[PDB]
Design a protein around this ligand. Sequence first.
Ligand SMILES: O=C(O)Cc1ccc(N2C(=O)C(O)=C(C(=O)c3ccc(Cl)s3)[C@@H]2c2cc(Br)cs2)cc1
Length: 123
Amino acid sequence: DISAKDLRNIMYDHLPGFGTAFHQLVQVICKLGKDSNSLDIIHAEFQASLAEGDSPQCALIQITKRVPIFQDAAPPVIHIRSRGDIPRACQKSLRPVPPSPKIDRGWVCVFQLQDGKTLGLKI
Ligand SMILES: O=C(O)Cc1ccc(N2C(=O)C(O)=C(C(=O)c3ccc(Cl)s3)[C@@H]2c2cc(Br)cs2)cc1
């Protein structure tokens, strides 16, 4: 039975670079997937997209569109001290939070900073 960590490493293994917006999307898919006992369907969708010839990035997006727990779901909020705690490769993908952000429209997560500032991570 695949764990979140294992699924994470599996997806990380398919991604170029480190600490990119897609890496954080993996973190989010795995955490929300674990909480909803869906690590198995998520792994299978991911593998099936690759087998279709989709890029891993495309496959991760397909998950957010085809696995039921992400459809119409708001991005998770993640409390961090400062903006520096966010990975360098993610810094340019940070945006003001729109009124109704959705994971299946590219909003991976919302970072809530200590002093009240918020930033969404966009793909
Ligand atoms: O394996 C599990 O039990 C599920 C799981 C638990 C925590 C994590 N995370 C961590 O332990 C951790 O450091 C995660 C993370 O994405 C980040 C933390 C700080 C910045 Cl900056 S990004 C990351 C999080 C994902 C979400 Br949604 C909220 S926290 C990931 C998966």
